[PDB]
């Protein structure tokens, strides 16, 4: 009997006031929340934000919507949500968000005989995540999603994670290109602004950057170039062309790396550790070339001094580079 | 009793004329404003603007909305804001603004027994900010947000900062990786257009650009290449091919750095500080190459003069470059 269902639904909305929360003027209304992470689209270090798509479900109880005689859970059309009171939940750290609307608006309203309302949305949100890039690419980030009621204080509404630690699902199936989600965490608290205290839910992810290929891509070529620059100290002065070739090649390669690879790296004007390491290697190869130039200059008049300088350089340069690497790793690992 | 509140709200909204401002035809309505800054997402010199996210709150009084018998401040659903008079506040220098609308429109309406209305929005605005890049990247910018009433003159509405200089908060939340907030200022005034006088509020920030990234990426490579160009003097002047190759390599590397350092900057006609430094380094390497060319031209008949010219260049060029750097860093700092 669909006529009886229509009559009951019309009676439920008869005299309903969307401007008044459930139990207005009384105890706070408790709202439980679930999030199903469909995907995490991209994580940006330039824009300091990440994009995340989710099924966001809210659960609450409204006694004005309690119905009897229908032994079913009424899944209604989404437009019915326009005639009902819904919580003013929003995300504090979002920069842009939308609810999908193809083919219809991605929204679900489900009523229960006792007056319980389940309200589901499908939301793609870009959320800001400030990142400490000082240790890039050896860094580890912590990106949060914040959930709060915009207008109602703790005297009116309350939030909690429905299901405890199982409120948020689908994290383990998320694959990120340059990050691996080590852990996720759920927090509930209260936040005080000048207008009062509001409930707050937090969903945080700890991201560890995949270092397997970063070492082999941006560090190994520089270290090999520095070693090749060292190699020039073991060549006799009669083979000056080889020394000139090695020195010029290493210096030009380091200039090209500094100018281009860092451009390929995120273009945010930040001082990372990789930049310091590349600059150190560049300075070392430049010093090696200058040492060769000095040896060549003083070669004719004082061959013995040139030989002594080369022999001492063979020891000094690797030792100084080892000390520089030790300090760099101590200060960044 | 929720029915009493519902009937009181209906009585308040019965006969309410949204087309007429409070005290229409009489004294002006005083509107106080508060801003709680969430973040400044980005500051762009190419587009000459900055993105700002804020909680914008307005406080005014409407005697038509005064209610009695309910000793509470009614926090109403934001949709009722569509049925009340609100000030026509706009931002003169904005280019693209919106009110966040997930899950609902981030809007707050609060009524008081005395008739006072508190109206809050969460707004992201891309406000224009013309910048002077003559000292880039050692510059200091000043970006403002202008708040005005469009249709109502000073005989109809008044603007003031509620709370004095404590009307804007969240300044410490601003974290720009390239800038640093130095000072923020609040101004109130009147602006006269052909249609009359209007109230005006102004929130201004002074930003100072960081220099470490530019030191590591632009100045140091140029200095190193300039120092490399001086090795040509210490080479014997008979090795014509080697010295020519070294000079040409330095010139080409300088030009490649200059062409690759276009960066995210507008095509301004004036000369920036970085442009001056790059031109100076190019002038130095060009002068070194020209000095070698003169030496090669003249040494075939007067070897003593050529040797003297090389010996004097070895001292003149570093000293002149040191003087140039001293002048540059004393003028621009």
């Amino acid at each position, epitope marked *: 009997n669909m006529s009886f269902v229509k009559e009951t639904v019309d009676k439920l909305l008869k005299g309903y006031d969307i401007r008044l929360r459930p139990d207005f003027g009384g105890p706070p209304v408790c709202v439980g929340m679930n999030i199903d992470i469909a995907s995490i689209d991209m994580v940006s270090e330039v824009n300091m934000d990440y994009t995340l798509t989710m099924y966001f479900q809210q659960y609450w109880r409204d006694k004005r919507l309690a119905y009897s005689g229908i032994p079913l859970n009424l899944t209604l059309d989404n437009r019915v949500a326009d005639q009902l009171w819904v919580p003013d939940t929003y995300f504090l750290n979002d920069k842009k968000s939308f609810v999908h609307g193809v083919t219809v608006k991605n929204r679900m309203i489900r009523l229960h005989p006792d007056g319980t309302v389940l309200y589901g949305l499908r939301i793609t949100t870009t959320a800001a995540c400030m990142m400490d890039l000082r240790r890039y690419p050896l860094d580890e980030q912590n990106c949060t999603l914040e959930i709060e009621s915009y207008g109602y204080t703790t005297d009116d509404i309350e939030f909690y994670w429905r299901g405890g630690d199982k409120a948020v699902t689908g994290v383990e199936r998320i694959e990120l290109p340059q990050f691996s989600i080590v852990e996720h965490r759920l927090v509930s608290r209260n936040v005080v602004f000048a207008t009062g*205290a509001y409930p*707050r839910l937090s969903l945080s992810f700890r991201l560890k950057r995949n270092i397997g290929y970063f070492i082999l891509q941006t560090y190994m070529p520089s270290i090999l170039i520095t070693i090749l620059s060292w190699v020039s100290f073991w060549i006799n002065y009669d083979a000056s062309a080889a020394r000139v070739a090695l020195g010029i090649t290493t210096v030009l390669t380091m200039t090209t790396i500094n100018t281009h690879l860092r451009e390929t790296l995120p273009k945010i004007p930040y001082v990372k550790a990789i930049d310091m390491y590349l600059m150190g290697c560049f300075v070392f190869v430049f010093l090696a070339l200058l040492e060769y130039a000095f040896v060549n200059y003083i070669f004719f008049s004082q061959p013995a001094r040139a030989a002594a300088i080369d022999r001492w350089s063979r020891i000094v340069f690797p030792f100084t580079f080892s000390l520089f690497n030790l300090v760099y790793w101590l200060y960044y690992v | 009793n929720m029915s009493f509140v519902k009937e009181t709200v209906d009585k308040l909204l019965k006969g309410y004329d949204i087309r007429l401002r409070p005290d229409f035809g009489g004294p002006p309505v005083c509107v106080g404003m508060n801003i709680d800054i969430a973040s400044i997402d980005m500051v762009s010199e190419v587009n000459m603007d900055y993105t700002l996210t804020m909680y914008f709150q307005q406080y005014w009084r409407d005697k038509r909305l005064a209610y009695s018998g309910i000793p509470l401040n009614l926090t109403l659903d934001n949709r009722v804001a569509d049925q009340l008079w609100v000030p026509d506040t706009y931002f003169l220098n904005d280019k693209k603004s919106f009110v966040h609308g997930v899950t609902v429109k981030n809007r707050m309406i609060r009524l008081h027994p005395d008739g006072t209305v508190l109206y809050g929005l969460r707004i992201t605005t891309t406000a224009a900010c013309m910048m002077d890049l003559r000292r880039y990247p050692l510059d200091e910018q000043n970006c403002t947000l202008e708040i005005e009433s469009y249709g109502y003159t000073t005989d109809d509405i008044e603007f003031y900062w509620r709370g004095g200089d404590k009307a804007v*908060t969240g300044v410490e939340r601003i974290e720009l990786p390239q800038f640093s907030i130095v000072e923020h200022r609040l101004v109130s005034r009147n602006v006269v257009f052909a249609t009359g006088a209007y109230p005006r509020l102004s929130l201004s920030f002074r930003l100072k650009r960081n220099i470490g990234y530019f030191i590591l990426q632009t100045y140091m490579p140029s200095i190193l290449i300039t120092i490399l160009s001086w090795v040509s003097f210490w080479i014997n002047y008979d090795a014509s091919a080697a010295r020519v190759a070294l000079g040409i390599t330095t010139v080409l590397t300088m030009t490649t750095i200059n062409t690759h350092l276009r960066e995210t900057l507008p095509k301004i006609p004036y000369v920036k500080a970085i442009d001056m430094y790059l031109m100076g380094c190019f002038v130095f390497v060009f002068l070194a190459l020209l000095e070698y060319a003169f030496v090669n031209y003249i040494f075939f008949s007067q070897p003593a003069r050529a040797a003297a010219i090389d010996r004097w260049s070895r001292i003149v060029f570093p000293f002149t470059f040191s003087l140039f750097n001293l002048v540059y860093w004393l003028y621009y700092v």
Partner: nanobody
Amino acid sequence: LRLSCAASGHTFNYPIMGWFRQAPGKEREFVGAISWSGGSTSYADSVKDRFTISRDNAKNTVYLEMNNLKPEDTAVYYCAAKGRYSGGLYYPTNYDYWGQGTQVT
């Protein structure tokens, strides 16, 4: 008198450090707040123009320099850390990590 509060650990997740003082017969009261990165400072009117706040990232220490002490400035002090999205600045409930009580008379 000069108070120094040294912080160690995940200081990037808590970029704001604040100072509070508790009267012997009252509740805690805000004193000042310092941002770690920008060095921006915020002060309360009751102790303004008398106290200065700075920070140094070499050791991650925030310094509160106190000048022109008065008998009204007798309270037990606390140094606290605030999260990035923790909300208001003048309210002790929004601060997660605290320090140890310091007596000044």
